[PDB]
Every structure is written in C-alpha cells, then in structure tokens.
Write an enzyme that holds these catalytic residues in place. Structure first.
Site, mmCIF file in Angstrom:
data_model
loop_
_atom_site.group_PDB
_atom_site.id
_atom_site.type_symbol
_atom_site.label_atom_id
_atom_site.label_comp_id
_atom_site.label_asym_id
_atom_site.label_seq_id
_atom_site.Cartn_x
_atom_site.Cartn_y
_atom_site.Cartn_z
ATOM 1 N N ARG A 246 0.853 -1.177 0.000
ATOM 2 C CA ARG A 246 0.000 0.000 0.000
ATOM 3 C C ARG A 246 0.894 1.234 0.000
ATOM 4 O O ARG A 246 0.702 2.145 -0.799
ATOM 5 C CB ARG A 246 -0.923 0.006 1.220
ATOM 6 C CG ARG A 246 -2.101 -0.961 1.119
ATOM 7 C CD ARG A 246 -3.151 -0.648 2.182
ATOM 8 N NE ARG A 246 -2.684 -0.930 3.538
ATOM 9 C CZ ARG A 246 -2.701 -2.139 4.095
ATOM 10 N NH1 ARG A 246 -3.168 -3.180 3.414
ATOM 11 N NH2 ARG A 246 -2.249 -2.311 5.330
ATOM 12 N N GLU B 39 -19.929 14.622 3.026
ATOM 13 C CA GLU B 39 -20.229 13.710 1.938
ATOM 14 C C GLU B 39 -21.466 12.834 2.094
ATOM 15 O O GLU B 39 -21.406 11.735 2.657
ATOM 16 C CB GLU B 39 -19.017 12.819 1.662
ATOM 17 C CG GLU B 39 -19.261 11.720 0.631
ATOM 18 C CD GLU B 39 -18.006 10.921 0.328
ATOM 19 O OE1 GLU B 39 -16.980 11.147 1.011
ATOM 20 O OE2 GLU B 39 -18.044 10.065 -0.588
ATOM 21 N N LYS C 1 -12.741 14.212 5.801
ATOM 22 C CA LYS C 1 -13.829 13.644 5.021
ATOM 23 C C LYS C 1 -14.578 12.625 5.873
ATOM 24 O O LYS C 1 -13.966 11.870 6.627
ATOM 25 C CB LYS C 1 -13.298 12.961 3.756
ATOM 26 C CG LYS C 1 -14.327 12.068 3.074
ATOM 27 C CD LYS C 1 -13.721 11.265 1.944
ATOM 28 C CE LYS C 1 -14.501 9.974 1.718
ATOM 29 N NZ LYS C 1 -14.226 9.344 0.380
ATOM 30 N N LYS D 143 -19.322 17.129 -0.875
ATOM 31 C CA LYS D 143 -18.885 16.076 -1.775
ATOM 32 C C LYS D 143 -20.088 15.195 -2.059
ATOM 33 O O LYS D 143 -20.251 14.138 -1.458
ATOM 34 C CB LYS D 143 -17.768 15.245 -1.131
ATOM 35 C CG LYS D 143 -17.244 14.093 -2.001
ATOM 36 C CD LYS D 143 -16.045 13.404 -1.344
ATOM 37 C CE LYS D 143 -15.483 12.276 -2.201
ATOM 38 N NZ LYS D 143 -14.274 11.654 -1.573
#
Lengths: 342, 342, 342, 342
Positions: free
Chosen positions: C54, C186, C145, C228
């Site tokens: 990753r 979001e 977020k 978002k």
C-alpha cells in the site's frame, strides 16, 4: 418560553367537558353530516335532500327518549343543524342539552389537495375559527370536531401529508381551547386498499406519534382534548380475515404506544364498518387484556344511524321506529364501550 | 415519492413571470394596503378613509407615465383595488398591464395569535386560496404576496412561531404555483426592539433556513418564487449607529447562507425605513463585495409613496405632484437596485 | 441563543483552507482507501494487500511531479498513509505539503446498520473525533472527510436515514471546525438501482435540503466547509441513455436548489463512473448554462487512479508509468473543473 | 416502510427483562460511577482512588444479603466493576445474578460540548456500541444506561440540545435492543439554577416530548425500554419551598403528558436530593392521586449509598455497617416505590 396558554380555571372547564363526554358506557353520536354527504345518504332511501328533510331526519335522532342518556355523552352537530328546531319549535340544541348530553360542532371546512402528492390532502377551516368557536360556545357547544384524512398505499401517508395535517390538527386544537371548547382531534387513516392489519397498525402508530408531537409543539392541553382515530384494521380489499380480538389487540397496542395517559378518551370512528362490526370490534377493544389509561368508546356516524335511517325511509309514520333503531344501537355501543355487550 | 407538482410548461410560466418582475433595475410597488392600514395612512394627511378616496389615491400612483416602466417590474394590489377603475373608466389592472408591468394581489387574510406564545402570531388565508388564485389569475394577476410576521425579543421567534409561519408560507406558496401564480414568500422579522445588527442577522438566518426547508418539504418550485425578507438591521431602539455598508454586509451574508441560488430574486421590504434610508441601504446592498446569485431589488410600500402621499394631501390639483414624488422614488430605487444610485 | 462557535480568526482560517482546496482548475485526490477496500483494488492487479504494498502504491501517486500542482488542491489521506514515508524516508505528508497541496484525512469509522430500515445505514466515528482532529491538525491536516451513504429503491432514503446521517454529518462538521479543520460533508446517494435521472435528482434535492438544514441547526460555518455529493445520474441499471449535458443540467439544478451560495465549493465524487465518464460529466457540469455561486470540481478516488493502478500492476519498474497515468487524469480533470477540457 | 426491527421472540425478551427490573416495590442500584466521579466520592471519606479501593467499596454494596432481593430489581455496573470479583474470587456479576437481580452497564462514553451553545452538551459512546452490547450481553448484562444532560437557564435547553441528545438517546436505544439489551433512556435535566417548579415541569415536558418522538423515528420498541428522568423540582437555588406532594404532582403530570403507556417503568434519578429527600419524594409520587400506567420507582446512585459510603469510610471493619446502611435505604425506597413508606 412558557407563557400559560390557559388559566387554571380554563384547563378545568376543558377537562370537565372532556370527561363528561367519555364518561363510562357513554359515546358520541356523530350527526355532523355535511349537506353534501347528507345528499348521498338520503338518496339511498329516496328522500329529496331538502333542508327540511334533513331537519326531519335529525329530529328522528334527537327525539330519542331518556334511555339515550346512559349511552350518549355527546352529539356532534353540523352547523345548519345546530340552529334547527323540532316541530314544537324547540331548538335541537336545547333538547340535547336538557338531557344533559354535551353539544358539539364540526368546524373544519373540508379536505383539500396537497400539490405534489399522490392524491393526498389536508384540511381547511382555520380562517376565522377563533371567532366561530367563540360563537358556537355562545350557542351551547362545548366541543368540536375537525377531520383530517390520510390514505394508505405503496407510498401515501407521506412525510408531507403526515407533517401537515398533524400540524393543522394542532392549530385547530389550540384555537378551540383558547375559546373554552374541547377539540376532538380526528386523524382518520382510511381503510381503502388491500393492506393487512400489520401495515395499518404501523401507519396508525406513525401518524399518531406525529399528531401528538405536533400538539405538544402547539402547546395544546392534552387532558382537554379527545382522539377520534380509526381502529387499526385491514384494508377493505384485504383478503385476510381477522378476529375482532385481533383487531382489538392491534388497535390497543397502537394507541398505547402513542397516546399519552393524559388524554381522557379515544372515541373511535365507525369508518366503513357495519353497525354490528363497529359494536363487536369496540366491545373486543374494551375487553383487550392490555391496560388502557383512557376511555375507549365510540364517535359513530353511520354505525349508529344506518338501520335508523333505513327504517325512517322518509316516512313520518316510520319516525318512531327509526328512533328505536337508533336508541338500540346507541345502547348496545354504550355497552360495547365497557366490554359488556353480548 | 416524486409525483410532479408542476408540468414543464407550468414551471416555465412561473419562472418567466418571476424573472420579469425582478428584471434588472426593476422593483415592486407594494400598494396592497388593507382598507384598515389605509385608514391610518390617509388620516395622517387628512382625507376621509372612503373607498373613493382610496381609489383616488391609488390612481395617483397608477397614473404614472412610461418612465415607471424601467424601474417597476410589478405592482402588488389590494383586493378592492384590483377591481377599481380610473376616472376614464379604465381598470387599474388594465393600465399597469399595458405598461408591461406585472400584476399581483395580497392574498393572506391577516395575522392571528399563537396561543401559548409571547404575543407571537401566524397568518391566515389558506381557506379557499386555490379558488381565489384561480380567479385572480383569471383577472390578470400573475404573482401574489402573503405576509407572516416574526418578532425579536428575549425569547420571541420561538420554535413554534418559526415552525408555523414557515409552514404556512410553504402551504400558500404551493397553492399559488398549482394555479400559475408566482408567490412572494414574505417572512418579515420586525425591527421593534433594542437588539443590535448581529442579533437581527442571526435570527434572520435561522428564520430563512427554516422557511426554505419548509418550501422543500411542500415541494415548492423555488425558481418560481420570490423572497420578500426584511433587510437585517438593528432594532428601532438600538442605540448603535451602522453604515449602510455594514447593513448591506450583514444582509447579504445572511441571504447567501440560506437562500438557494435557484431563487430568482429577493425583493426587500422597506419596513420602517425612510424613503432615503431604503434607497441608500438597497444601493449599498447591490454594491456589497460578496457575490449574489439572485436579484436584490425592492418591494417597497411606504418607501415609495411616503412623499407622494404627503404631496397629494387629498387635493385633486396636487395629483400630478404626488405622482411625480412617486415616479421619483421609483426611479431612484430602480437605480439602487443596481447599486448605481448616487 | 447565539454563543459564537468560532472566533473571527478561526472562521478566516477555515474559509482560507476551503478556498485553497477548490481554487480554479484544482480538485481533490481521494487516496483515503481503507485497508479493507484497498485489498479489493490491489487484488484486481495481483499485489498482496500488505502495508508495504500500500505504501508503495500511495508512493506512486504522491511522487507525482509539479504539474500536479495546477490541478490538485488537496489530497485525502487514509490514517495509516498519513504516517507513511517514501523510500527516501520522507513523510508523504511532507511531500504533498511542500508542493503547496492541502492535506486531509478520512475520519469516519465506517457505515453501520439502521435497525428497522430496509438495509439502510448511518456512519460512526464521532467518539473521540475532537481529540483526533486536534491530533491530525497537529500532524498537517487541514481538512477531513466523512462518508454517509444513502440508497435509492422503492422506499429507501427513508425519513430516518435522511434524518440521521444529515445529523451525523452536522455533528462531524461541527467538531472539525472547532479544531481548525475544514470538513467535507459527503452525503453519497448510491447509483445502484434502475431509477431514471429524474428520480435521482429528486432524491438528491431532498437529501441535500435536509443536510443543510442540519448544518444550520448545529451551527456549522458554511463558508468553511465543502460538499462532496454524487452527481445526479440514472441508476447503474437504468436502461435510458443520457447526455453528459443532461446529467450536468440535473446536477447543477439540484445543487442550486439546495446549496447556499456561502459554500465555497462542491467536490463531486466519481462514484461508479469511468475515468472518462467522470471527466466528461464534470466538464459538462462546468459548461452548464445555469449560474453557479460555487466551485464545481472533483474529489475523485478511482476516477483518478484506475489506469494508474492498472499500469503499476505492483511492478517497481511500472512505477513511473503509473505515476504518469495519474498525472494525466489529474490534469484533464483539472481542465474539466473549468469546463475547458476537449 | 415497515421492516421489523425485532422479531416476536426478541420483543418478548426485552419486555420481560424490562418488567423484571421495575417489578413492584423494586428499584435500581446505580453503581456505575466512573473511575473519575468515583475519585471525588472516595476523597470525601479519605480512601485513595485505587482500583482496589473501588472493588472493595463495590463489594460492600454487592455483599448485601437476601433482603435486598425484595427492593432491588437491577444493578447498573460501571465497566471496570462488571469484571471485578469479591474476596472469595466470585464475580460481582455472578453474585447479583444468583440473587435474581438483573445486571446492567453504563455504556455512554461521557458528555461532550455542543459548539455554538451556551455550555450545552451531548453524549458520545455510539462508536462500536453494537459490538460492545453483544459482549456485555454475553457477560451477563440485560440492560444498559446512557446519560444525556440538559441544563436550565435563560436560554439553555436549546432546540439543538434537545434535538441532539433526544436523537442520540434514540440511536443508543435502537442499538441496544437489536442486541437483546433493554436500554434505560436517561435525559437528565439538571437542577442547577434558580428556576421554580413550574419551569422545570415545562422544560421536562418539552424534553420528554422530543425524546419519545425521536424514539419513534428510530423505531425503538417502547415496551422494551425504561425512562430515567429527573423528578420535576425547583432549581437548587430556588428560594421557594415545595411540598413533596407538590413535587409529586408536577412530576406525575409531566410524565403523563409525555410518556406513552407502553413504557413499562420510569426509574427516577436521585439527582442532588438527600437520601431522605429522594425517598420522601418518590413515596409522594407513588401516592399522587393521578393515575399512572407505568411503574414509578427509583434508579438511585448517591441516594442509596451516601450513608453507606459514609459508614464504610474505607475501613474493613466498617464493611458490615456500611452494607447495612445501604440495605436500609434500599428497603425504604423499595417501600417508597409503592407509596407505602412512613
């Protein structure tokens, strides 16, 4: 944020009036049929829809004798009727009053369309309602009725329909109380449809939950009001058969999950039920195992005057027979209102 | 849960009407003074409050010449007036229509008490509004006005007052649109009090935020509506002095934190401001640095006819002078509506 | 009832951070893939889902050169990643920071079940969020977020699902701001289903309308936030074909009926769109005739790294090619973010 | 919109557990004192705030003999404690369980700040609560407690504070039930302030009204919950003196205007009342003329262990005396819980 809507004296008057109406073994005779709906009922038995023919028929009901006193706590009048007199020139209001029965008036001004919904509605009548209540009170009324109508379908009792309606009821209720008039909050969820008992209970629970939150928001005095809901039952078109036991079970469960103990009584609406169906179901309800902090009687319209109207048939002779048919149902339901009807 | 409230054609008609009204450098003449409030205004200049004296005065306004066309997008009529004619027998509506100005009517039926609040209110007029709109449209109206009134105090714009009102507006708006009539949503927060600019902005923001959420709930078509709010300003009794710059800053900030871009225009209400105060403040607003997705003009009542009324003084000779005083303010505000007024 | 949530200084810092992120021609790289979802993406190209693999892949993205500066305003990190370093021992955060790009972290702790709903959810992560934000800020993050997920079906975005979620977002947002961190709200309405564009627009409008009312209720500073949302589009299973023009039309209409002008920018989510589909649609949006008071760019995840990931394929040699594939999409979308992409 | 949150079996289990706890003459021992608040209580009697000293003290309570069985329906544990054992190596949980008393755990993770309010809060703990409940159940718990805190001042229980909180409670409740754990919904309105009885009743009524509407919205099973409210009483600083009769009158009125009949029992919180004050007031409540559809007992913390703690004083010898002091109060309150305490 607490500016006393009602004085102690006022709260008292409302509470008393409320309790008198739902007193044990007592129910409500709903004779508030609009001249419009009255046309349909009269047509079924011939009878031209005249003001006179209506006065005549209402007379058949109001001329009932004293045995109506044990089972009828109140009578809901249609405006027109509240000012009519019997053949002896005696105000129908006077008569009902003398028997110690409470007088009430339908005050809503009909249902109207909610733009953007699937044929849903709301109710109008708030304009000038305060002045009107003040007047009606001055003319002998102590309680009123306002009917909102909800419908069950794939997507009908919509947030909007529930939001509005619940709100209108609260407005109406608030206005009545500041005029010394007990308001009957009637959020009727129609039976039309093929939904099963489960669904009706669900919807009924959600609608009521909203209705009471609204009343709270508008500072309505609960112990000075009455609830006239629909019994929770399957849709007219539901194939499934249910025990009046099962109906009573769902109805009481729904009510005890939403109505605060402070509400003095719930006066069920006969809806589309038959004279017997209403009586049986009401009785069953009053025989349900579950505890009930409030009166569970009736506020029947057709379920009290179907056979009565059918007997009268417009004939002056059939008057007494018609009156008997009424007193009969009035008495049985007065029993069903205590679960003691066989 | 989406059952098209309006067809594409209908949405179009509404949007167009809306835009015509708030077209650049154009504002609204609010001559919807109730026969009641009209009594007070006429009394200040003598003049008996007759239907005639009112017709006469409204005539002074409607007889303005073509230079009124560049600054007046619409005229709000009071019912009575919508059916009056000038001395030549020409319908006031006809006249305004011929100049290409849009016609509108006040439809609310007055403010009423909210039981349980600190002298707060709500507005009535919903009963039969749909039939009425249909009629008004048929008589030349394309937009309407409904006034709700909120008040600022230690604890006034209450959850209830904001809840209701916001809801009533939404109902009214919904009904107008299904009748091809653009609704002006007017949630007026009165200036009474000694609160500072900060507070008025706060309250204004909360009230509007509620108003639009309500409109959403009722499926009101935003691009086919108009907002007639109060400019955010200190209470009449606030000691502090503010720049029209400062007022414009707060007003625009408030509006851009709550009004969706879809709303075509915001037509401010003159409130208690003087003819100049309104013009200056409006101009300042249109000169505010912050971006504005919507028209920011006026929907003035007294701020357009104060001096006009003062000139007329009921005299048939002073008519022309009165008309001039009006056209003057109408023009300057038409400039302030573009920030180009010196 | 107004107790200043943020000081003037604080509001400034938030607003600035917000604007830097959505600055013209700039968008957001969403590399906040949970170790879980990261397993799925890596599996598609072989690659064992190691912390190293990753780190390696994230490196491919963060090692992009300076041309990424013109189109990338911010990068959303997954916790783990926010503390990883490149092969030179240089903190990924440091690198992105030096290019002047803003740093952000996903803070929600996953979606969870809403008992009593049709497989609907809400999001968790609020516990200790304030301490965490304080820390993340201290480590270089300036924005966060939180992803809520709504679903469209015969009866899915339910009052409850909309009520909660809208509320959670508001909570999360409120907490971030008191910690100097701009929150990206979001409310993703999934594309799954066979619903047409009309419906998605409807639902999107209702969801957003609720989201902003919630933010208001929680006193969230709008000009210090970012939205978002999903672009309004037909369900993956909808048969009907639509023009990116048509999509842009619905998307912008929806947004301008609900988002207040104060919101600095809307950073669309690529959703299930292809790298091109996202770019085309975004471009179309920025070319829509309707006026837009806010930035309309991107906050893409797969739409920015699909081909990039596909190129890398886990190979150390393919690193540079992978990085190119990314920079390519980053640049085109930076253009689409201004409607100037051919 | 009805997707069965709980099966028939599950609803049963919850209802049973609930009823066992509030069974006649039975109340709740709230020994869920956080290691933090426990420090303060121990300090008042010397005693270092060790894990041991806490285990020792909790032991003093849990070692009560069988006469505690008639008055204690349940015991609320603090996490730590739920895993401690007595000197014989016997799990405190085991002991309480063997006496047939129900076991519960505080699950909320503390109160937190509501940005933008006047020092108001909300509560956290929802993250991972479902997994935790599943575990706690697996360890012998059948009910939980979550404490929200509201405050009364010129403008404190704010729409936001009431909105949130009511919502958090509903979330918490919903999660507990899907894990077979009865949730005690505790919306505590603090006594701090100089407000009179009237005001506390008002606020209590509004808060509860919101709390139940929330529970409805979240589909919480009422008959499988318990309410732990504050008794409505004057602020600590109110000069006015009130009869425990007067307090009982307001408390019961408030509750019967908001709590649905379906709620099995209301377990009052001792708050700042003295051991006697709590007992007297509770007794008075259970002797109030007004009808009560639900159990009205106690969920006392200090009011059950004040003197007990004072006796123990950390001494191993005083253990038995301390235990007696507890059993004493436990018994009297068990009587007050039936209005039969002299």
């Amino acid at each position: 944020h607490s500016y006393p809507a009602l004085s102690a004296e006022q709260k008292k008057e409302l509470s008393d009036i409320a309790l008198r109406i739902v007193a044990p073994g007592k129910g409500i005779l709903a004779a508030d049929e609009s001249v419009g709906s009255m046309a349909k009922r009269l047509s079924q038995i011939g009878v031209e829809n005249t003001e006179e023919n209506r006065r005549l028929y209402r007379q058949v009901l109001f001329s009932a004798d004293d045995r109506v006193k044990k089972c009828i706590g109140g009578v809901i009048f249609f405006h027109e009727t509240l000012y009519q007199k019997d053949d002896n020139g005696v105000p129908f209001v006077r008569t009902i009053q003398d028997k110690g029965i409470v007088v009430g008036i339908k005050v809503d001004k009909g249902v109207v369309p909610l733009a953007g919904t699937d044929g849903e509605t709301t109710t109008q009548g708030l304009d000038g309602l305060s002045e009107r209540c003040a007047q009606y009170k001055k003319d002998g009324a102590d309680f009123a009725k306002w009917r909102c109508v909800l419908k069950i379908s794939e997507r009908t009792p919509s947030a909007l329909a529930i939001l509005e309606n619940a709100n209108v009821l609260a407005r109406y209720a608030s206005i009545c109380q500041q005029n010394g008039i007990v308001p009957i909050v009637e959020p009727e969820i129609l039976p039309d449809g093929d939904h099963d008992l489960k669904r009706c209970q669900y919807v009924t629970e959600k609608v009521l939950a909203a209705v009471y939150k609204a009343l709270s928001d508008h500072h309505v005095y609960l112990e000075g009001t009455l609830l006239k809901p629909n019994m929770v039952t399957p849709g007219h078109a539901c194939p499934i058969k249910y025990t009046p036991e099962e109906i009573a079970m769902a109805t009481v469960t729904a009510l005890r999950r939403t109505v605060p103990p402070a509400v003095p009584g719930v006066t069920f609406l006969s809806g589309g039920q038959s004279e017997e169906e209403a009586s049986f179901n009401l009785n069953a309800i009053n025989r349900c195992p579950l505890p009930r902090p409030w009166a569970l009687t009736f506020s029947y319209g057709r379920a009290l005057q179907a056979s009565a109207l059918n007997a009268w048939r417009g004939q002056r002779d059939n008057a007494g027979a018609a009156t008997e048919e009424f007193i009969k149902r009035a008495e049985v339901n007065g029993l069903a209102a205590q679960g003691k009807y066989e």
